[PDB]
């Protein structure tokens, strides 16, 4: 096609909410700059560029929204991948330093690779006054009609477009709200032993430092995450095991890490956590699980090895469920209404855990 545009191939390669991740870390970006006016027949200035790194042409519009008389701008990004850790931080800084510009980003794929600095950068970019959404059918349809040299060819979506779009929107909302959905918590954090449809695994984590003679909660370190499964993926415990290194814990001070898990760790995750806590002796790791993942009879050895290495394994009760509801979900002031059979299943799983811990 002509210069400055992309073709159906590059579009269908960069803009896709499907399991095919990214062998090559490239990111395409389509920008629409418009003068913030009252009219609907305004001239929308459209451009697009891929990540060249050496020269950075994707930020060529930065000079296009400079302070000129009394003009405001409504920039719209149609970025392929999600912004980088540093790109989002610098964009938030620019938005703070330029009040005459508003920003609306439509992301197609979220950086599944998690990082507290990345999440903090996204939340700060959202705090600076920018809107962030996930591309749906209308966004891909509009981008295909203006930034692709389609020789009279209409847009043809993929099968699981909305199915992946809603899941990515849920993950986005979890990232930006800094809290999981209430229905998601009620669904995944159930208490019955045998359940169906709980494919994913969520995990909340809290950190407490030992100061004076008590456990002072490091409130800026509490968080939560989910599994990725999916490209393939790991489990929730393994995904949590490489977030601890980014915490930069002191080594001659002791800490307590509390992990509220929807599913109990499997055998591989149990052995990995056992090795981790055998290496890091300055962290006391306690696990409160809602359900006991049987793991086809291989989880008893994992739990016993974890307890041997040194952990306080226990089953979540009403108090832990209520604490997780009040601290981790977007309840918006609503109380924690427990489901039927809470204490019954809690004490049943407590007795079962007791039986498993005594080599039985
Ligand atoms: Zn596992």
Listing DSSP states for 238-295 in one string gives: HHHHTTSGGG---SSS-EEEEEEEEE---HHHHHHHHHHHHH-TTEEEEEEEEE---G
Q: Is there a single domain that holds both residue 167 and residue 188?
A: no
Which pair of structure tokens corresponds to residue 35? Answer: 């003068």
Q: Is there a single domain that holds both residue 145 and residue 256?
A: no
Q: Is there a single domain that holds both residue 168 and residue 190?
A: no
Domains in the chain: how many in total?
2
Residue 114 falls inside a structural domain? yes
HSE-CB at 140 with a 13 A cutoff on CA atoms is 23
Q: Is there a single domain that holds both residue 13 and residue 119?
A: yes
The domain that holds 14 is classified in CATH as 3.40.140.10
Q: How far is the CA of 234 from the centre of ligand 1 (A)?
A: 8
Q: Is there a single domain that holds both residue 245 and residue 124?
A: no
Other CB atoms closer than 10 Å to residue 301's CB: what's the count? 14
Q: Is there a single domain that holds both residue 162 and residue 187?
A: no
Residue 2 falls inside a structural domain? no
Q: How far is the CA of 306 from the centre of ligand 1 (A)?
A: 13
Angle (CA) 189-195-199 rounded to 5° is 70
Q: Is there a single domain that holds both residue 169 and residue 197?
A: no
Q: Is there a single domain that holds both residue 150 and residue 59?
A: yes
Residue 3 falls inside a structural domain? no
Q: How far is the CA of 233 from the centre of ligand 1 (A)?
A: 11
Q: How far is the CA of 343 from the centre of ligand 1 (A)?
A: 26
Nearest to 83 by CA among 71, 95, 74, 65: 95
The structure was resolved to a resolution in Å of 3.0
Other CB atoms closer than 10 Å to residue 242's CB: what's the count? 12
Q: What b/e readout covers 154-164, taking b as 16+ CB neighbours within 10 angstroms?
A: eeeeeeebeeb
Residue 255 falls inside a structural domain? yes
Q: How far is the CA of 220 from the centre of ligand 1 (A)?
A: 27
With beta carbons less than 8 A apart as the criterion, state whether 70 and 77 touch: no
Cα of 202 vs its chain's centroid, Å? 11
Residue 1 falls inside a structural domain? no
Residue 187 falls inside a structural domain? yes
Which pair of structure tokens corresponds to residue 108? Answer: 């197609």
Which pair of structure tokens corresponds to residue 188? Answer: 């995944």
Q: Is 161 helix (H, G, I), strand (E, B) or coil?
A: helix
Which pair of structure tokens corresponds to residue 16? Answer: 């896709």
Q: Which domain holds residue 214?
A: 182-358
Q: Is there a single domain that holds both residue 75 and residue 114?
A: yes
Domain boundary (112, 142, 177) is at 177
Distance (Å, rounded) from C-alpha 303 to C-alpha 97? 52
Q: Is there a single domain that holds both residue 168 and residue 302?
A: no
Distance (Å, rounded) from C-alpha 166 to C-alpha 133? 11
Q: What is the CA radius of gyration of the chain?
A: 24
Structure letter (DSSP) for residue 127:
H
Q: Is there a single domain that holds both residue 145 and residue 116?
A: yes
Q: How far is the CA of 125 from the centre of ligand 1 (A)?
A: 33
Nearest to 121 by CA among 87, 95, 148: 87
Residue 194 falls inside a structural domain? yes
Q: How far is the CA of 235 from the centre of ligand 1 (A)?
A: 5
The most distant pair of C-alpha atoms in the chain lies apart, rounded to whole Å, by 78
Q: How far is the CA of 297 from the centre of ligand 1 (A)?
A: 14
With beta carbons less than 8 A apart as the criterion, state whether 46 and 22 touch: no
Q: How far is the CA of 198 from the centre of ligand 1 (A)?
A: 14
Distance (Å, rounded) from C-alpha 307 to C-alpha 300? 11
Q: Is there a single domain that holds both residue 100 and residue 161?
A: yes
Residue 23 falls inside a structural domain? yes
Domain boundary (152, 177, 202) is at 177
Helix and strand numbers, DSSP H then E, in the chain: 11, 11
Domain boundary (177, 194, 214) is at 177
Q: How far is the CA of 263 from the centre of ligand 1 (A)?
A: 9
With beta carbons less than 8 A apart as the criterion, state whether 313 and 303 touch: yes
């Amino acid at each position: 096609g002509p210069l400055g545009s992309m073709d159906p191939d590059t579009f269908s390669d960069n803009f896709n909410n499907r399991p095919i991740a990214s062998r090559r870390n490239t990111v395409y970006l389509c920008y629409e700059v418009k003068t913030k006016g009252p009219s609907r027949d305004a001239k929308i200035f459209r451009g697009q560029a891929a990540s060249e790194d050496k020269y950075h042409p994707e930020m060529r519009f930065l000079s296009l929204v400079s302070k000129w008389r009394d003009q405001e701008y409504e920039v719209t990004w149609y970025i392929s991948w999600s912004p980088c850790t540093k790109c989002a931080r610098d964009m938030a800084t620019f938005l703070q330093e330029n009040t005459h510009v508003t920003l609306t980003i439509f992301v197609a794929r979220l950086y599944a690779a998690a990082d507290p600095d990345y999440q903090e950068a996204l939340r700060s970019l959202a705090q600076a006054g920018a809107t962030i959404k996930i591309m749906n059918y209308d966004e891909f349809q509009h981008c295909w009609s203006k930034f692709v040299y389609s020789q009279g060819a209409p847009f043809q979506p993929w099968d699981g477009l909305d199915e992946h779009s809603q899941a990515l929107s849920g993950r986005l909302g979890e990232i930006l709200r800094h809290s999981m959905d209430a229905a998601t918590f009620t669904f995944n954090f159930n208490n019955e032993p045998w359940v169906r449809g709980r494919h994913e695994t969520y995990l909340c984590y809290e950190v407490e430092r030992m100061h004076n003679d008590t456990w002072v909660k490091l409130a800026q370190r509490r968080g939560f995450l989910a599994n990725q499964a999916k490209l393939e993926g790991r489990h929730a415990a393994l995904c949590f095991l490489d977030v601890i290194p980014f915490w930069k814990l002191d080594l001659d001070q002791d800490y307590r890490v509390t992990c509220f898990t929807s599913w109990s760790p499997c055998f591989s995750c149990a052995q990995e956590m056992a090795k981790f806590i055998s290496k890091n002796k300055h962290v006391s790791l306690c696990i409160k699980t809602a359900r006991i993942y049987d793991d086809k009879g291989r989880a008893a050895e994992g739990l016993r090895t974890l307890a041997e290495a040194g952990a306080k394994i226990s089953i979540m009760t009403y108090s832990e469920f209520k604490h997780c509801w009040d601290t981790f979900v977007d309840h918006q002031g609503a109380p924690f209404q427990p489901w039927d059979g809470l204490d019954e299943h809690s004490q049943d799983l407590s007795g079962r855990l007791r039986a498993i811990l005594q080599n039985q």
